[PDB]
């Protein structure tokens, strides 16, 4: 027995928490990403990068704490602890935004580790690797939003900050600056997410209301046996119901469960593509035909033009505080405002 | 042999390609009326004075819209919550200007969708099924009531109901955020958890069942042909699925009972969407998302901004621009 | 020279036809506004 | 409205070419029996 094979043996022992070779990458990176977020949201400010308080220590609550992005002046610096910006000073590293890159990069390698773990366990147990494949969607979203998007922009400053409210701000930024709701790739993402939740609900309800009476109890959970070969619910009755209610129904259980994989995974992949475009400000911002008409015809009004006015409000009213490095000074008289408000 | 009882037998027949049923007797005419009016208005309705300020908004294709920008526009703020059927207008021209079709469509639709839910109960009873699929559909149904009926009731006007259009929807979302800070409201946060979690568990369940299909086919044919409609044997090995998922996390975080599993699949998104529908329905009465505006101040009393104050700046820009001609007084109280 | 043994027939069932047509038509319905712009 | 005139042929081929592909495959499936 060679040393490599003995380490393999140990890594792959059946224990309460399986380790694997993938564990060597996953477990440190996941725990560090998670610990960095808890550490930063509990103790670390965003005063010097953002002009914001962002920790429990400072008075924030669970909704407003964040690990915020580094200052725009850092560009796309890796912001290594030992790098030229922090120069090994942990305190300054925290104050400059180093925990952001720390979490994002450890988080990325942790995500790789997790998908490798899905591959590793699937190979050991003898199943097909479709759960790993499905997980590619969360990966694509993470890299496109947290990494590719800021890399096309001026700096990590414009990536999402890791916090509840900070992400809310990210949503609103994308509306006002990118008109992201108008983007067909986001729309396909919305359909895959909302379609997935629909499939989840309708499949679970269907199964639960087409059960075979396999026991005498009023609690029907007891009448299932994980080793029984029989289907626990009637595909035939399910199919009849939905055919008569909705017009069409599933008839093939394999297609049904593949479709459940397909819909949300595809939707997430589509949204990631749109965000790659927004990395370059390659937006679906306008319809040219609408703008030509509206410039010429002051009586022409649509929900599209109404929403651009809202975007314009968002940009002028949030930019000075949201982008402090720009030193925007907008006197009262230049702020867009409707009547009275 | 009696005419009424034969009619009753056809209405409730389980042999009709589409089930009719007593709920269907109401659903079919009301959905057809809503559908036909909707299609015609979307294509050809003239511009509608949504905010009652004689500033008509063009919603239809023939008046310069595309599929993304087009909408059936809500009825005039001048009407408020007043009932505006056709026969109350002096002319169809008037009815179209003031947004009549919106009312016709949403009332017929909400009635028809309600009956759709009852119809789901009804056929389950005729088929000897358990009855609660209709309870799953009450979550989307409740959400449509929230944006088409409850929110207008609370704000006093169908002009603040959700427009029937793609860009109109986004307009409704943005204004809602400025006036209610819906993102900072826990019931919407639960909606996101219901919908993100629903998509997660959809993919999980689909991938775990797909991962454990039993080999029944060759590399040259779709694996789906390994399942035959109505076969008695399960088509995947749930013990292998559990053996994988329990090791991916740990044993006791994985279901081995398919009934509990599918009940969980049903319950998570339904309950999340109930909450988000209740979110809209209670922000209808202006019980709004958390306000942490200027909650952090320093020893001297300077405001120390948090991400909540940045949200507020965005909300202000939405507030001051929306319906830019419609406010004469300084507070937008509805 | 013998005929090529690797040839296989290809299939598309009716349900796949309906699913694929719906996908294409809905995609067209979605993107056409952006193509006309 | 001043739309891109090439949007028509773009849309027409976007519908036509994939649809025809599927019809070709379906009809030759049926005639196999």
């Amino acid at each position: 027995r060679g040393w490599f094979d003995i380490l393999d043996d140990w890594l792959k022992r059946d224990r309460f928490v399986f380790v694997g070779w993938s564990g060597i990458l996953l477990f440190p990176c996941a725990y560090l990403a998670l610990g960095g977020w808890l550490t930063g949201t509990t103790f670390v400010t965003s005063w010097y990068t953002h002009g914001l308080a962002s920790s429990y220590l400072e008075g924030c609550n669970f909704l407003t704490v964040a690990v915020s992005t580094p200052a725009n002046s850092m560009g796309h610096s890796l912001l290594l602890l030992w790098g030229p910006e922090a120069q090994g000073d942990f305190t300054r590293w925290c104050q400059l935004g180093g925990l952001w890159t720390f979490i994002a990069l450890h988080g990325a390698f942790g995500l790789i580790g997790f998908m490798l773990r899905q591959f590793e366990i699937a190979r050991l147990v003898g199943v097909r690797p479709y759960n790993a494949i499905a997980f590619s969607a969360p990966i694509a979203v993470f890299v496109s939003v947290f990494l590719i998007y800021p890399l096309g922009q001026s700096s990590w400053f414009f990536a999402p900050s890791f916090g509840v409210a900070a992400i809310f701000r990210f949503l609103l930024f994308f509306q006002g600056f990118h008109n992201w709701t108008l983007n067909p790739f986001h729309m396909m993402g919305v359909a895959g997410v909302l379609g997935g939740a629909l499939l989840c609900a309708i499949h679970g309800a269907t199964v639960e209301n087409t059960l075979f009476q396999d026991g005498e109890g009023a609690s029907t959970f007891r009448a299932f046996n994980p080793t029984q070969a029989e289907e626990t619910y009637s595909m035939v009755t399910a199919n009849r119901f939905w055919s008569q209610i909705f017009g069409i129904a599933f008839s093939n259980k394999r297609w049904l469960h593949f479709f459940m994989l397909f819909v949300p995974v595809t939707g997430l992949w589509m949204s990631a593509i749109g965000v790659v475009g927004l990395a370059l400000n390659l937006r679906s911002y306008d319809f040219i035909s609408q703008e030509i008409r509206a410039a010429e015809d002051p009586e022409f009004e649509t929900f599209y033009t109404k929403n651009l006015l809202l975007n314009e409000g968002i940009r002028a009213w949030m930019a000075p505080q949201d982008q402090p490095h720009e030193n925007f000074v907008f006197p009262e008289e230049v702020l867009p405002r409707g009547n009275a408000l | 042999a009696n005419l009424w009882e034969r009619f009753c037998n056809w209405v409730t027949s389980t042999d009709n390609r589409l089930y009719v049923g007593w709920f269907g007797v109401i659903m079919i005419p009301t959905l057809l009326a809503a559908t036909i009016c909707f299609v015609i208005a979307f294509i050809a309705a003239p511009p509608v004075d949504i905010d009652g300020i004689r500033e008509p908004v063009s919603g239809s294709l023939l008046y310069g819209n595309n599929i993304i920008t087009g909408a059936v526009v809500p009825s005039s703020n001048a009407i408020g919550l007043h009932f505006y059927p056709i026969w109350e207008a002096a002319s169809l021209d008037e009815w179209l200007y003031n947004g009549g079709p919106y009312q016709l469509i949403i009332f017929h639709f909400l009635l028809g969708a309600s009956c759709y839910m009852g119809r789901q109960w009804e056929l389950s009873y005729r088929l000897g099924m358990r009855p609660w699929i209709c309870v799953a559909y009450s979550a989307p149904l409740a959400s449509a009531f929230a944006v088409f009926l409850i929110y207008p009731i609370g704000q006093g006007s169908f002009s603040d109901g959700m427009p029937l259009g793609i860009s109109g929807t986004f307009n409704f979302m943005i204004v809602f955020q400025a006036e209610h800070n819906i993102l900072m409201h826990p019931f919407h946060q639960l909606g996101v958890a219901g919908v993100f979690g629903g998509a997660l568990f959809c993919a999980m369940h689909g991938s775990l069942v797909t991962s454990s299909l039993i080999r029944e086919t060759t590399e040259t044919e779709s694996a789906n042909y390994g399942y035959k409609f109505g076969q008695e044997e399960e088509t995947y090995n749930i013990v292998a699925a559990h053996g994988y998922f329990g090791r991916l996390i740990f044993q006791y975080a994985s279901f081995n009972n398919s009934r509990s599993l599918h009940f969980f699949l049903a319950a998570w998104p339904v309950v999340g969407v109930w909450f988000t529908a209740l979110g809209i329905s209670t922000m209808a009465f202006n019980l709004n998302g958390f306000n942490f505006n200027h909650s952090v101040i320093d020893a001297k009393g300077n405001v120390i901004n948090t991400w909540a104050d940045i949200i507020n700046r965005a909300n202000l820009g939405m507030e001051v621009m929306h319906e830019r001609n419609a406010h004469n007084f300084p507070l937008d109280l509805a | 020279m013998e005929p090529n043994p690797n040839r296989q027939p290809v299939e598309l069932n009716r349900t796949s036809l309906y699913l694929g047509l719906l996908l294409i038509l809905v995609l067209a319905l979605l993107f056409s506004s952006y193509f006309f712009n | 409205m001043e739309v891109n005139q090439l949007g028509l042929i773009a849309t027409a081929l976007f519908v036509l070419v994939p649809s025809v592909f599927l019809i070709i495959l379906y009809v030759q499936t049926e005639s196999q029996q």
């Binding site: 017009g247 069409i248 | 109505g230 | 349900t15 | -």
Partner: peptide, 30 residues
């Protein structure tokens, strides 16, 4: 021309619904 295109595609989808429901491949047991 753009209006015609939008309504044409929409109409094709409605027609497809008809075939998919009434001319579906019939599900057959075992």
């Amino acid at each position: 021309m753009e209006t015609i295109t939008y309504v044409f595609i929409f109409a094709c989808i409605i027609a497809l619904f008809f075939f998919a429901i009434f001319f579906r491949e019939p599900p057959r047991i075992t």
